[PDB]
Amino acid sequence: TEFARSEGASALASVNPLKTTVEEALSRGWSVKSGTGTEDATKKEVPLGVAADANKLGTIALKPDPADGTADITLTFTMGGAGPKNKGKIITLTRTAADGLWKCTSDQDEQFIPKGCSR
Numbered sequence: 001t002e003f004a005r006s007e008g009a010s011a012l013a014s015v016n017p018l019k020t021t022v023e024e025a026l027s028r029g030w031s032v033k034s035g036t037g038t039e040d041a042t043k044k045e046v047p048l049g050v051a052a053d054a055n056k057l058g059t060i061a062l063k064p065d066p067a068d069g070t071a072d073i074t075l076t077f078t079m080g081g082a083g084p085k086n087k088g089k090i091i092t093l094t095r096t097a098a099d100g101l102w103k104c105t106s107d108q109d110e111q112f113i114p115k116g117c118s119r
Contacts, residue, residue, distance in 0.1 A: 002083030011077040012114045014055040026069040033066040057081045
């Protein structure tokens with residue numbers, strides 16, 4: 001009776017909004033850094049603004065950290081808090097630096113991969 005479908009949706013919903021945050025920072029020539037806090041005007045780094053553990057289904061991570069837009073960026077949701085079908089599975093949003101485009105891939109069982117995401 002695990003909520004495997006809604007777990008996937010919830011995980012994606014915790015990282016999907018961060019794409020906006022990333023694009024806004026890069027549009028200014030600022031970097032993004034993980035975690036919460038204030039905009040650092042010395043280093044020109046914008047925090048993502050979300051705690052790594054905001055969603056108790058798992059953890060959110062940024063790579064590279066910080067990221068300046070000149071390399072590929074990933075936002076991952078690692079589902080360590082999920083039930084058995086999704087525990088240990090990872091949803092990855094990749095922004096390719098060469099074209100500024102985002103994709104979503106997941107290593108979940110294909111039945112539970114959220115809309116817009118591929119293997």
